[PDB]
Symmetry: D2
Subunit: 415 residues, 4 copies
């Protein structure tokens, strides 16, 4: 039984693909594989106050189909919270509510997702040229292999730690903050260091300050202070569907300009409200004569070691150009993520995937990896296209349009 | 040919009724009659800057049907402005754009509206009890009569002038501001008085200030300054669909409380941004040494007379408790509207319509006038239900839910 | 030793009087008497998040003297927080910081305030006509009497409870919220009812929600939802120094208009941010499936009784027009305050004080009570002048100007 | 008659110096020379809507002296606009009001400034080592020379045009926008090109759009859209007085970090409100079917030439990577400014001034140029210190503190 398309990973990207497949008139067969037990959308960072960084109109389908049964508005309506939400006049739902949206959409979905199923490899199907791929799926019980004419790889970002620092029972990446935090005695985290100047670092510091009144926090970051995230309307147009074409069709020189001028829309920046909330907290503590938030600016974390009952963090100060040690209970590294890379999974298919001058995968406008003739099945990327398609590639900004374009591409090449 | 339902008037209310009819599985026959040549939604007040006072989610259908082809989101999508609109992150469209939305929806509607068709009267059909009404329609060419089992009256508000003051060549109600203003030669309106402290008055004064740099404006209002319109989320719940039930089922005492505490959500109040903009304008003029906006507070316009080349406005000052004269070119009365009243159109049928203690029409929860057993046909009101259904009755707030309720009521009764 | 002026009470009002006295070139002798041990500015309501409802520019002196050593800006500067405060770009300090400002100003003040000194009575001095008053002061040790030519009464508002409800171990007025709350055991206040729809009620509910995750709160209020406080710039002009003259010189008709149109600036209304924060809290709880905030609208608390371990609150529902019982641990009445009334402390002198038609004290523009020729000494009111001077009379809005006018009046009479 | 200090230029910087001199107890003699007829603070850009980019608390003196007679608050008070301003609740005055503030402060100043006086050169005084400088001043009538022990150079920024584009009758730098614009027949500027993505470009485009309804505007800028200016509170701390020490004492590596992370606080960025206003304007025009604003993004102006009645602008597109011609009536270059450089004026004295590795002037913490022992007189820079003192050097952010430090330095060295 050969599938038209197999989806690796079931995050918002492949979920929107599933929605696009269902809404398409095209009769396409599909299977989706998620390693986790259920949809799990950055749950390590599902902090109490956390807000979406994208408007509710940017959901699973709305920009492609303005009357989708899978829209956020449909969700609110079924949950009897549309009127309430509307009264709030805020475009940004909580991360918690959006997670419920994802689960709700997955349930409404006709197709049944295969959970606890880790794709361990993708191998060429029989033939030359290769017209199908073999997908190795490892469940808790057995292992199996499915065959598909197309694959869509959407396995998400991979946590990035600072150069000389390894995850530990006392050094956590921000992606696994709540995982470790919940398991911990309250009075076993009175001193916490958080490295980074982005949204994650800011949200964790805010949470720590608000969670206990005694916790002392050291926010270590290279900038002189948090930099604001730009989502003013003109700059925000880089997230437009049409901006994908501008980026894709533009010269390397234009592509560079996107990053040079608009990196501050997405990376190493913090939402206005979070910055201001942190600043008020610091101010009020000063008034009260009880400072707890220590902003260690113009600085990098360069090492961490466990010494008795302390986590010894080595901090490099750019101002003085020297290192020193900071003793805390826990070091949280909110130091970001590296992009999705299909290379690992593609194993030997990769040989046939054409690279560019930089060493990156060549991808067509329709998100399909460029291959030699020796390979003829479709390999589509949702994620890992920051160099070809631009800043929206790993975001929720353009799920609706990308998923639709991929389905169309698949229908057209089967067509 | 007897219609299930005839609609009198084609504003947003009956338009949403038409949409509800089309979306309903029920096979109901209908006809709609609008006097004007086309949809005309307060065009006299379609000022350059004017913004909706209602969220875009409160459109023709969305609260009833979250995936309607007639939703504002569908409209934006079709116009290729959805992405642009989203980037703006504002829930409130311009009045200009909403007008286009109405026209767009009317065009998409399968049914064909009858324009240039004034309903002059509604008369009882043959038989006793009366099972149908006869609707007299006057076109430019002929006159005709149509028969219906139900009618829905949605003829809108009626302009209310100050007591001693009549519309004239130099005394305009705000509802006809642009009608008169465009027909004037600029420079013949160097001195304008605007009476009122509500959104209309504020918008007109702002427009006048911005339109020409030399115009002198007298803003005459009873309050000490503009009062802000409350749309904070808890108070804004009075506009909820469910609030209709709370108001309807509540005692007169409760009904009174709605008005006592929340009149400032809708009447005699001004949007925050408009107030702030007016204040900045006045402040900068002061800095420049060229004041043009004169706020005449704690005051009422009590008369107007034409004397040579001057419109003489008589102003009563509450502070000094005395009247005085103000000479201007034009007096604009932004003094509000009276509610829709179905009594004139009803004529003979009114005898079978039951009134309450206060002499107002009794209306059922489903917007159907209460009648004696002599009348079996349905008379539904969209508008004129402020005393039975509450503050949303004449607003865009609840079009989707009311229209659906009426269609359901008609379907239910159809035997 | 006869003083030019004695001040009864040492809150912000008399504090600004002290400042005006020190800054005045006039050589006036004074004494101030405060019952409490130190300045105590609504400490029972000094909640963690609480923010001033007045701009920092409205401090002890700034509107009168733009370069006062007692300005809030001077305070910030001495506390090394001016730059930090400026970076925040918020006109509204915390109540906590403002309290600190008051104490700071009191210290910087040359004059020494007499604390733990309750003024028990004011009696006429010797002679006829009366040229001085005798002020009876009760300290913890002894009692004494001082003599003064003028007296300024600024004893503050008096807590108002609902009719038929008395303060008790389990029924608290909002003014004494923190007093009682700090003194209970956190696990003993799992169910709290808060009566009222104003700033106090809102702030207490917010605090309760944020303080513990399990507390269940019933917010009982007559309106359908919190009403927003108006401080938009035109309406806000009722707090202007000049507005005092408009109100004072205006007819009763005009005075009524101030209250009719602008009560929503000050009474029974809540700050925008607090309303929105409460609404987000309620929304997120619903998403989480753990509702804790119960808004009991269109309702009054009419009785409270202790029954075993429950405080049984009798609630009247306007909608149903019937009472019912609500069992909680504690009832907090955030039901407001009655104005300052000099009558009680005046005793014998009150006969020579002239009343108006409505039975309230007549007061001159300079805040001096109108007396018969029998009294020649000056009795000045800071507070209790809402009927003569308007809504700013009991607020921080106009401390600088009023205090200056009183000092001037005293200097002028002496002369 | 040898002066303690001579000030070259009379902008806000030297004005704050004059204020610091007057407020200082030190008896220092001074003279100030301004080439313009009066204070002239970027008048070519005094557009109708233009707002200050700095809080009113950052004025001539307030951060140094919180009760200065020259504070903005003192100014508002004198102008009888303090209460009005406070009601507005906006920290940012208009540029127009701030200009009045500067004139007001100059008038209040005891010292009298010499206008129409261009400093053409600074020469060494007699003796070795040099203990004084000779300042050559050229008035309209005569020329003269004054002698001083110290000199403060504050001659402001110098306009920077795009490479290969010269100012002309139809090519204007933004700094001279209103100069040219007022001298032009309104019907002669139908087509305008504005080059740049910063505050100036944005302000000019908004002005053009608002000034005439038919003007077509081409906004040519290298970014994909306007980038927002960061003034959120943590990043804004780079403008703090204390931040000057952090920057000054910090290593080159730290200095670089300031620019790398926080250049978006000051250069090539636009105020939030201006961006959103522009976006609304563009949106409404699209709704109306009359687009007038053309955003030419990812592009540079590389040439301009007059050809008949067309100003021919050559535009380089980074995307397509090709230059094309754009025909307009006028080209406005809002392409920024180069820093103040004392080199030109110093002439012979530069021989005793020390340069750093990069060839820039070495400056001490107290704004005094580093010299050899051959020169003993003080040369102070207000401006041109972006490399030693940081981003605030050419801004209004730190006038009060810098001016005070310079006066102190001078007093200390005369001692
Ligand atoms: C806290 C936070 C941090 C973020 N960091 C960044 C950032 O640094 N840069 C940026 O541009 N955006 C970032 N985002 C955006 C983030 O990428 C999206 O929001 C979203 O999850 C992307 O959707 P996705 O479906 O592509 O990937 P994901 O949601 O991450 O989903 C991938 C799914 O695939 C599964 N999976 C992986 N491998 C396999 C396998 N072999 N077999 C089966 N299943 C597999 C995973 O378990 C996961 O469920 C962040 C958002 C959050 C909230
Ligand atoms: C400037 C302005 C002022 C407003 N004033 C108020 C106010 O004071 N209070 C309030 O609560 N809301 C007010 N509104 C809201 C307003 O009611 C709605 O926005 C909207 O018009 C209501 O929809 P409707 O369809 O019920 O009435 P409508 O939009 O008014 O239209 C009714 C239609 O029926 C037609 N008609 C009338 N008589 C006949 C007839 N005999 N035969 C055939 N056709 C007929 C009319 O031509 C009209 O097109 C105002 C809105 C604006 C923009
Ligand atoms: C929580 C809260 C609630 C408020 N409620 C209202 C309201 O309902 N309406 C309104 O308009 N404004 C209200 N305000 C404003 C309030 O009145 C002021 O902010 C402020 O306290 C006014 O100044 P006073 O100096 O007039 O103050 P009062 O501060 O309250 O201070 C008077 C002082 O006199 C002392 N005193 C009293 N009697 C004697 C005596 N016999 N002998 C010696 N000392 C005595 C008292 O101990 C007190 O310290 C409220 C503010 C807050 C923070
Ligand atoms: C529209 C605009 C653009 C701006 N551009 C920038 C920018 O690009 N980067 C940035 O960081 N900040 C910029 N600013 C800030 C601007 O520098 C300050 O607000 C302010 O003018 C600086 O104060 P100043 O007195 O140091 O210089 P100026 O205000 O410019 O004053 C210098 C004075 O010296 C006079 N002068 C010059 N030479 C002589 C001479 N030989 N003899 C006598 N007098 C002389 C000048 O005519 C002038 O009056 C800008 C502000 C505005 C409003
Ligand atoms: N509520 C939400 O939806 C939510 C929550 C979190 C994140 N996100 C999104 O996810 C994306 C990533 O955000 P992120 O905050 O997780 O990561 P991020 O934006 O990449 O930021 C990483 C930060 O760590 C810094 N850093 C790197 N190495 C360091 C070291 N050795 N010591 C100290 N600091 C170091 C980086 O500095 P440099 O700039 O010098 O590299 C940067 O400030 C963003 O687009 C964000 O908006 C969304
Ligand atoms: N952080 C601060 O600076 C701060 C904090 C608190 C207060 N304040 C100020 O102090 C002033 C007073 O505010 P306030 O909140 O304390 O009082 P209000 O006087 O403003 O509050 C009274 C409220 O309780 C209601 N109420 C009265 N009797 C009731 C009953 N039997 N049952 C249920 N509800 C009842 C009132 O309803 P009705 O309107 O129908 O009578 C009203 O909603 C305001 O100016 C306020 O801004 C400032
Ligand atoms: N209301 C006010 O007080 C006010 C008004 C205006 C300005 N200011 C202040 O003055 C400072 C400077 O503002 P500014 O806008 O005058 O200058 P600016 O910030 O230096 O901006 C100059 C802009 O022109 C661009 N550019 C340079 N060459 C170009 C070319 N050949 N073609 C097209 N674009 C070109 C620059 O691009 P690149 O990014 O690639 O360099 C940059 O976007 C700011 O700090 C600002 O806030 C204040
Ligand atoms: N970090 C996510 C930013 C999302 C982007 N501003 C958007 O609106 O699409
Ligand atoms: N005057 C219009 C009021 C609209 C109302 N706040 C609503 O959101 O429905
Ligand atoms: N471009 C001027 C920036 C001013 C800066 N935000 C400050 O507060 O000093
Ligand atoms: K139908
Ligand atoms: K004195
Ligand atoms: K003292
Ligand atoms: K003292
Ligand atoms: K001096």
């Amino acid at each position: 039984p050969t599938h038209d398309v197999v989806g690796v990973g079931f995050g918002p990207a492949n979920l929107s693909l599933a929605v696009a497949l269902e809404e398409s008139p095209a009769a396409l067969t599909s299977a989706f594989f998620e390693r986790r037990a259920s949809i799990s959308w950055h749950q390590g960072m599902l902090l109490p106050a956390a807000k979406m960084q994208v408007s509710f109109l940017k959901d699973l389908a709305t920009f492609r189909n303005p009357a989708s049964r899978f829209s956020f508005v449909s969700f609110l309506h079924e949950r009897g919270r549309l009127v309430r939400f509307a009264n709030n006049h805020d475009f940004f739902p909580t991360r918690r509510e959006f997670h419920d949206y994802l689960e709700w959409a997955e349930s409404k979905l006709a197709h049944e997702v295969s959970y606890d199923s880790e794709v361990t490899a993708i191998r060429p199907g029989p033939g030359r040229p290769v017209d199908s791929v073999l997908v190795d799926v490892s469940t808790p019980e057995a292992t199996r292999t499915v065959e598909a004419r197309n694959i869509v790889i959407s396995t998400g970002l991979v946590p990035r730690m600072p150069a000389g620092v390894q995850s530990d029972e006392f050094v956590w990446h921000s992606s696994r903050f709540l995982d470790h935090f919940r398991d911990r005695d309250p009075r076993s985290l009175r001193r916490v260091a958080v490295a980074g100047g982005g949204q994650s670092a800011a949200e964790i510091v805010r949470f720590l300050h608000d969670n206990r009144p005694d916790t002392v926090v050291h926010a270590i970051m290279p900038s002189y202070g948090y930099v604001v995230a730009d989502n003013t309307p003109f700059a925000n147009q880089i997230f437009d569907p049409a901006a994908v074409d501008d980026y894709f069709d533009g010269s390397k020189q234009a592509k560079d300009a996107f990053w040079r001028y608009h990196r501050n829309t997405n990376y190493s920046v913090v939402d206005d409200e979070v910055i201001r909330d942190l600043y008020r907290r610091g101010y009020d503590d000063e008034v009260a004569g009880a400072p707890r938030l220590n902003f260690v600016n113009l600085a990098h974390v360069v090492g961490a070691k466990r010494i008795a009952d302390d986590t010894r963090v080595t901090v490099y100060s750019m101002a003085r150009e020297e290192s020193y040690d900071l003793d805390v209970d826990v070091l949280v590294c909110a130091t970001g993520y590296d992009p999705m890379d299909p290379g690992d999974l593609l194993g030997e298919l990769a040989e046939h995937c054409v690279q560019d001058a930089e060493g990156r995968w060549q991808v067509d406008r329709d998100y399909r990896m460029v291959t030699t003739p020796d390979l003829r099945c479709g390999i589509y990327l949702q994620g890992g296209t920051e160099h070809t398609h631009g800043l929206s590639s790993s975001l929720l900004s353009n799920l609706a349009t990308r998923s639709g374009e991929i389905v169309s591409s698949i229908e057209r090449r089967k067509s």
